[PDB]
Design a protein around this ligand. Structure first.
Ligand code: SF4
Ligand code: SF4
Ligand code: SF4
Ligand code: SF4
Ligand code: FES
Ligand code: MG
Ligand code: ZN
Lengths: 48, 208, 114, 117, 85, 96, 54, 124, 689
């Protein structure tokens, strides 16, 4: 890398990270999609 | 020249056609059809109860020394009355040739076991029974070969689901592996790939 | 029509084969309970054998009955030779499956299943 | 040519290369890719969900052959063993993080091997 | 005791429904005129025998087979239901 | 451009964030949420608009065979920029 | 590879330049190529003996 | 050869669970042409498919889950009679849909230029 | 007589005028094509269907060339193959490299026919053409660089939809398809240009980028937005409705669907009822359990009986739910069963089906000589019926006359007044249209169901029956042609009337009920000011619109995409929707809900499965279980004789349809009101641009 440095981008990580498994920095999966179906919110004002 | 097209061998096509006519003449009682595919493969369709005579002839005859059984398998075609199609692939070392013999059967009709002709038929027919449900009559030891002990159903039939009906896990309450109905965290996503436009006119079927 | 008989030409011969297989399975339950070190009773094993025999009591085809006794003989020889483990013998009992509701109201409460 | 951990790449501008065309999902032998897309706030064709089950993946590299924009790649990383099964079910944020961490080496490898493709 | 509706199921083509067709053709309008508030629903069967359903109070239903009846016999069977005998 | 939900949870570039009453937030306790900080929409908006003096331009994303399939964009509507829809790049004709 | 884009994929540069090549890349990697109907048994001399596919 | 007069029934031999034999109604049909394309090659054979069951969302990863073994099972038959016989011998309930074929149509290019009829087109 | 031609040497017997393409279709060969559609006129401009005749030195356009006697058509000859390769080369020469970002994706005819009939390599070494993108509204997205100038959208727009706003401007390689001005192509049949466009030039805007064709599973159901009962295909993906596509049925749907049918599936993801709801001590609706809600409802149902129990059925209810609710209310001797749609009960009433059916079927419009529309706007009440009328108009010079308000149908018609006094005049014989009807060989009278909602619906029905009787007497008595027709606009109306529901809510108004079951009743016909004080209301449904806000107990149900259900269309045909997805949350099937409620209340209904419910439907009305059948008996004589008895005076008001414009078309039912795409359509057609 000293002789042939890699191409620099603004989004490439500045600091490298090792494997963070077994630590509070470990990856936890989740669904990245929003809620498919919206339910109906009843009125807050009483009737009859 | 045509660099991207597979060349053909009309000499081998002629030799295979001649031998197919030869066999069809010698065994009129069982041979129903003979075909030669254009990549030079001879195929003989026989009545299902001529398995032992036809195989013994193809093994012992001087002009057909098919001493080796390359394979034995079945194909499931639910649209047919006899859905199962038993396929025998024979190899002749003396004449450096290969032949195929095809038979049909259904669920409740047995096929005579050919272990008296070829010894490889033993495990081949055990696998056919295990995976398709075809029973072979005089088989020395016919039982499951590939499926789990007590596995119910024959998985290679077209109507069998890909993931089956049960799945295994270890249960701590009973301290043993248990079998429970199948349940998938992500269901297999079935893709419809077939194009609505015809690809090969040469195989077009009559509108009927 | 004139279909090929696999083992039995009539339903009486098929019933005879069924009775022979039932005798074989009945006489093997004590040995199976002893060898596999199961925690069930011999009476429970015999009741399971009867129940498994009895869920095919609606069959009226001698060929289907012949195939059923063939498969029963195969799974009897898997038990005798101890090819099966305690796992499979106990798989005959479904000791871990939850009791599935059978009434309309319970099914309606649980979910969408018919 | 080595096929290791997967990554989602970006253009030099920082824009994601993936256009949610689902060719990788179609070609994946192991059905290890799950993709869901919708128009972005600027109208771009972009993914909202891009999952790869690394416990289902067979590391065959078909997804980067089938990608028309060089978005999904199989990077050089091979030392990414975890302690729980759930940590091996990557999502879009994890794959973009992998791309950002490994972009220099990924770019160098693609430059070295793109004339054989 | 309290009749709530009548339904007549007659197939459109079968010979067994010929009498029921004649009753509808010539005698239905008078019947509907005498009983304006009684729902007399005429529907069509496919290949089964003609039938007469009478729905009473609290969901009690009786079915009478009209197969191979005559036009006057259908009238008599229908008047038995309305009368009660 | 990351943003924080009212529950303290970071919001992803797709807008994902667990509700306050959602039980599924328990999985992040004593752990973290994997969120990529760079937003492609923000970066591509930060990109400037190129001006070329032709009705039709071509974009291949830069790099040639290392970009995207080459497409042609018609710069005739004077009320908007032509956007390459593979890479989201804006082009325009010199006005005034 | 066989110079037949209806069976083998085109090059990446051709795919990113040619309309026919892009179409064929898309179709090959999403649907695949159709094989004419038929059954074959082909065997080779694998190191463990005859390895065959029907 | 023996003579037995029974309807073929292989449910006891197929190994399917009782609920998936008895609570399932298959649909025998010819697929409708995909309206997005003009090809008619996918409307040649009859299909047999099962009724849709429940799919839910996985708590982790939000994938689509299922508990129905016969969800992706589709069988191809050359004839309605073959499909019905297969369903009958396997013991499933079935609903048959008669095949829909486009009716013959009278097309005439010269109709676009009628002297007195409304078929004359205003543009080409 | 039939002439003999040969396709690849095989003999075909074809009628004179049959084209080469149709003869090849007859022997089973589908010739490639882009500009040819069998529902549109013949263009012959894409030149993709060129074939070789045996002795002809020149290739012919198969789509526009009538066959001559003794022609041999060489469909797989060298000349034909080279012609296809050349044409495909030109098309792909100017096409853009947009396949990965194109919704046409795996369902593109350019791609499929390029893989089948074209070359695998490109010789084009020039620059491509880029075309400016037009804007024609919120439904159709135009990316016109992908257009292949096949002019299907122009022909479809003009001929089918009666809108001449599309055309080709300029000439040469720079010829463009569009409006030439910023005008929106808004019509009730606008998505069919999305369907017929072979390429990705016209794509669905709601469906944009969401899925790919291979992913989707296809469920064949029917449409419930109107009473035509159009056949559709629901495209789902991982348990989610993704798209609605047409399904061919040449006697109902004929490959087209309306915009409300196609683009209102977005309303199935909003305002959904997902859990049972009751009211707490504060009177606010709160979530509860199925057992709790059903126990409350069953307690009230056991408390009351007689005509103190009413049910109002809405427009999206199915035969199974209707018959289950009818049985449940009959178990308590109650009978206040009604629909929120009025039909005249004076005379024959609902006793004879050929008194509220569309007796001349949808396909029967194609044989009529004269058609008289009374008090309806078929363009918005039943867009496919109006499309059939326009098709018959164009291809048979059908004379259409409309009595009442002068709405804009897509074809020229003869306007007659605005008042039912014209209807009185025609029956007498004063009007010239009386002579036209008398001399017509096949007349048809269609009375819109919206006109029967007036205070004088019985009088209008009597007047039109008098007109039909006059037609029958003067013209031929014999024949199977039927003149009298009624066009419905509600999906559940015909099924309810068959089951024996009392049309309209007059019974509820007359005897206000203590307990009221609103089964999908979102029309707001009956409200709490009509009901007695402390009335108990159970709203069973799938959207929270009106009944849910006013209800005491809320029971979530299933939609047509989520239940297998039976619906009877306006011509009396019965069809069944299949299950595409499952009901969300704790929502259940409607008949299952009613059956569970009956079992809890102690009056258990005698059916436990869908087959048993269908058997009960067969007991009540067998036509509900005869599905594709449409043939029925005609009782016009009895109906007319019973109608002559009681007559009222026609109101002196003009016959004004409820829907006069396309916005009124867009916002019709609960799902349409919940949809956001329909809101966008309303905004676009109201505020323009
Ligand atoms: S490497 Fe192969 S198995 Fe893994 S995600 Fe890519 S295509 Fe799928
Ligand atoms: S093939 Fe590439 S661009 Fe297409 S969906 Fe996959 S990662 Fe995205
Ligand atoms: S219209 Fe067809 S060929 Fe053209 S870019 Fe779209 S998918 Fe590709
Ligand atoms: S927009 Fe589509 S339908 Fe219209 S001419 Fe172009 S390719 Fe044909
Ligand atoms: S299909 Fe005949 S020229 Fe277009
Ligand atoms: Mg299109
Ligand atoms: Zn670009």
């Amino acid at each position: 890398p000293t002789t042939k440095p890699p191409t620099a981008r603004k989004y490439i990580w500045t600091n490298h990270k090792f494997n963070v498994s077994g630590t509070p920095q470990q990856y936890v999966p989740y669904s990245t999609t929003r809620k498919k179906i919206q339910e109906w919110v009843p009125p807050s004002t009483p009737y009859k | 020249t045509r660099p991207t097209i597979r060349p053909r061998n009309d000499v081998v096509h002629k030799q295979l056609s001649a031998f197919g006519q030869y066999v069809a003449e010698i065994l009129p009682k069982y041979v129903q059809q003979v075909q030669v595919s254009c990549f030079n493969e001879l195929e003989i369709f026989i009545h299902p109860d001529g398995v032992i005579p036809v195989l013994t002839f193809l093994r012992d005859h001087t002009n057909a020394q098919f001493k080796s059984l390359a394979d034995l398998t079945a194909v499931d075609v639910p649209t047919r009355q006899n859905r199962f199609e038993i396929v025998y692939n024979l190899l002749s070392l003396r004449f450096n040739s290969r032949i195929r013999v095809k038979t049909y059967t259904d669920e409740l009709t047995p096929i005579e076991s050919s272990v008296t002709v070829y010894k490889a038929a033993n495990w081949y027919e055990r696998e056919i029974w295990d995976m398709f449900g075809v029973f072979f009559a005089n088989h020395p030891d016919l039982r499951r070969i590939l499926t789990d002990y007590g596995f119910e159903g024959h998985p290679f039939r077209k109507d069998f689901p890909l993931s089956g009906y049960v799945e295994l896990r270890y249960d701590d309450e009973v301290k043993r592996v248990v079998a429970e109905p199948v349940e998938l965290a992500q269901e297999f996503r079935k893709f419809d790939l077939n194009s609505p436009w015809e690809a090969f006119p040469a195989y077009r079927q009559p509108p009927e | 029509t004139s279909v090929k008989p696999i083992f039995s030409r009539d339903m009486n011969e098929a019933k005879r084969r069924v009775r022979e297989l039932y005798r074989a399975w009945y006489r093997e339950v004590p040995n199976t309970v002893h060898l596999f070190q199961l925690d069930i009773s011999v009476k429970q094993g015999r009741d399971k054998v009867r129940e498994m025999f009895m869920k095919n009591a609606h069959v009226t085809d001698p060929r289907v009955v012949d195939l059923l006794v063939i498969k029963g003989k195969m799974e009897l020889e898997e038990t005798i030779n101890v090819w099966k483990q305690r796992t499979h013998i106990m798989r005959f009992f479904h000791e871990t499956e939850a009791p599935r509701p059978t009434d309309f109201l319970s099914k309606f409460y649980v979910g969408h299943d018919p | 040519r080595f096929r290791g951990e997967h990554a989602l790449r970006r253009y030099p501008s920082g824009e994601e290369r993936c256009i949610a065309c689902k060719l990788c999902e179609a070609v994946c032998p192991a059905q290890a890719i799950t993709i869901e897309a919708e128009p972005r706030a600027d109208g771009s064709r972009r993914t909202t969900r891009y999952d790869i089950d690394m416990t289902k993946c067979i590391y065959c590299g078909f997804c980067q052959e089938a990608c028309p924009v060089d978005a999904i790649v199989e990077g050089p990383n091979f030392e990414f063993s975890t302690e729980t099964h759930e940590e091996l079910l990557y999502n879009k944020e994890k794959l973009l993080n992998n791309g950002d961490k490994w972009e220099a080496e990924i770019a160098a490898n693609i430059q070295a091997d793109y004339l054989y493709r | 005791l309290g009749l709530r509706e009548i339904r007549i199921h007659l197939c459109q083509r079968s010979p067994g429904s010929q009498g029921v067709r004649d009753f509808i053709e010539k005698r239905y309008v008078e019947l509907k005129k005498a009983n304006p508030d009684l729902p007399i629903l005429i529907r069509e069967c496919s290949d089964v025998q003609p039938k007469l359903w009478a729905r009473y109070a609290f969901g009690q239903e009786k079915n009478v087979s009209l197969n191979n009846f005559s036009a006057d016999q259908v009238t008599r069977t229908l008047e038995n239901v309305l009368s009660g005998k | 451009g990351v943003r924080t939900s009212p529950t303290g949870e970071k919001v992803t570039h797709t807008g994902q964030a667990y509700d306050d009453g959602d039980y599924r937030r328990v999985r992040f306790s004593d752990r973290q949420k994997e969120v990529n900080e760079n937003f492609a929409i923000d970066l591509i908006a930060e990109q400037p608009v190129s001006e070329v003096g032709s009705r039709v331009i071509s974009c291949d994303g830069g790099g040639g065979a290392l970009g995207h399939p080459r497409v042609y964009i018609n710069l005739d509507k004077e009320t908007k920029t032509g956007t390459c829809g593979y890479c989201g790049l804006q082009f325009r004709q010199p006005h005034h | 590879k066989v110079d037949d884009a209806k069976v083998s994929p085109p090059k990446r540069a051709e795919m990113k330049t040619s309309m026919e090549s892009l179409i064929h890349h898309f179709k090959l990697y999403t649907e695949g190529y159709q094989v004419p109907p038929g059954a074959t048994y082909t065997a080779i001399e694998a190191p463990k003996g005859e390895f065959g596919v029907y | 050869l023996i003579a037995v007069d029974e309807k073929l029934d292989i449910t006891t031999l197929t190994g399917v669970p009782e609920e998936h034999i008895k609570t399932r109604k298959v649909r025998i049909f010819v697929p409708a042409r995909n309206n997005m394309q003009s090809g008619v090659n996918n409307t040649k054979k009859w299909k047999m498919e099962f009724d849709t069951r429940e799919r839910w969302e996985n708590p982790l990863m939000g994938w689509s889950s299922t508990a129905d073994p016969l969800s992706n099972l589709v069988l191809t038959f050359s004839t309605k009679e073959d499909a019905v016989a297969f369903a009958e011998k396997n013991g499933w309930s079935f609903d048959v849909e008669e095949r829909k074929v486009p009716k013959p149509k009278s097309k005439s290019y010269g109709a676009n230029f009628s002297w007195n009829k409304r078929t004359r087109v205003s543009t080409k | 007589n039939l002439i003999e031609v040969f396709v690849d040497g095989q003999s075909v017997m074809v009628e004179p005028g049959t084209t080469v393409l149709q003869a090849c279709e007859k022997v089973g060969m589908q010739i490639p094509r882009f500009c040819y559609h069998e529902r549109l006129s013949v263009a012959g401009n894409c030149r993709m269907c060129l074939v070789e005749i045996e002795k002809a030195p020149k290739v012919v356009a198969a789509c526009a060339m009538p066959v001559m006697k003794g022609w041999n058509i060489l469909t797989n000859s060298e000349k034909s193959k080279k012609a296809r390769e050349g044409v495909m080369e030109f098309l792909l020469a100017n096409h853009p490299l947009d396949c990965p970002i194109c919704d046409q994706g795996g369902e593109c005819d350019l791609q499929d026919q390029s893989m089948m009939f074209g070359s695998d390599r490109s010789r084009f070494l020039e620059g491509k053409r880029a075309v400016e993108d037009k804007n024609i509204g919120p439904l159709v997205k135009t990316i016109m660089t992908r257009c292949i100038q096949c002019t299907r959208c122009i022909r479809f727009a003009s001929e089918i939809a009666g809108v001449d706003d599309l055309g080709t401007t300029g000439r040469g390689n720079d010829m463009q398809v569009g409006t030439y001005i910023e005008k929106m192509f808004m019509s009730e049949l606008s998505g069919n240009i999305i369907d017929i466009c072979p390429v990705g030039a016209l794509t669905s805007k709601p469906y944009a980028f969401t899925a790919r064709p291979w992913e989707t599973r296809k469920t064949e159901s029917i449409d419930v937005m109107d009473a035509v009962g159009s056949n559709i295909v629901v495209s789902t993906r991982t348990g989610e409705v993704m798209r609605i596509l047409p399904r061919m049925h040449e006697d109902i749907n004929e490959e087209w669907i309306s915009d409300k049918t196609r683009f209102a599936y977005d309303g199935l993801k909003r305002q959904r009822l997902t859990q049972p709801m009751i009211r707490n001590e504060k009177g606010l609706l709160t979530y509860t359990t199925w057992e709790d809600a059903l126990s409350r409802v069953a307690g009230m149902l056991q408390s009351f009986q007689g005509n103190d129990v009413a049910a109002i059925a809405g427009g999206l209810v199915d035969a199974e739910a209707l018959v289950a609710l009818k049985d449940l209310l009959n178990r308590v001797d109650s009978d206040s069963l009604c629909t929120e749609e009025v039909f005249p009960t004076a005379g024959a009433g609902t006793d004879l089906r050929s008194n509220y059916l569309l007796n001349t079927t949808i396909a029967g419009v194609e044989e009529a000589d004269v058609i008289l529309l009374v008090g309806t706007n078929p363009r918005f009440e039943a867009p496919l019926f109006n499309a059939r009328i326009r098709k018959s108009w164009l291809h048979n010079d059908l004379k259409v006359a409309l009595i009442g308000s002068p709405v804009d149908l897509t074809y020229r018609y003869d306007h007659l007044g605005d008042s039912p006094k014209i209807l009185q005049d025609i029956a007498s014989g004063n009007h010239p249209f009386s002579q036209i009807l008398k001399e017509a060989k096949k007349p048809m009278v269609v009375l819109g169901s919206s006109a029967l909602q007036r205070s004088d619906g019985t009088a209008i029905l009597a007047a039109v029956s008098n007109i039909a009787q006059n037609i029958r007497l003067s013209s031929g008595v014999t024949g199977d042609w039927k003149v009298m027709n009624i066009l419905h606009r509600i999906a559940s109306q015909v099924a309810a009337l068959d089951l024996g529901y009392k049309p309209g809510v007059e019974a509820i108004r007359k005897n206000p009920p203590k307990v009221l079951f609103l089964l999908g009743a979102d029309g707001g016909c009956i409200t709490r000011q009509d009901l007695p004080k402390d009335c108990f209301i159970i709203y069973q449904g799938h959207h929270g619109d009106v009944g849910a806000p006013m209800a005491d107990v809320i029971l979530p149900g299933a939609a047509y995409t989520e239940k297998s259900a039976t619906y009877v269309n306006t011509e009396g045909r019965a069809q069944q929707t299949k299950v595409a997805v499952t009901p969300p949350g704790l929502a259940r099937e409607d008949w299952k809900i009613i059956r569970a409620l009956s079992e809890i209340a102690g009056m258990t209904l005698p059916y436990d499965t869908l087959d048993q419910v269908r058997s009960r439907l067969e007991e009540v009305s067998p036509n509900l279980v005869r599905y594709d059948d449409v043939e029925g008996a005609n009782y016009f004589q009895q109906a007319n004789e019973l109608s002559k008895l009681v007559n009222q005076q026609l109101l002196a008001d003009p016959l004004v349809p409820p829907q006069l414009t396309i916005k009124d078309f867009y916002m019709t039912d609960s799902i349409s009101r919940a949809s956001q795409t329909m809101a966008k359509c309303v905004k676009a057609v109201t505020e323009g641009i």
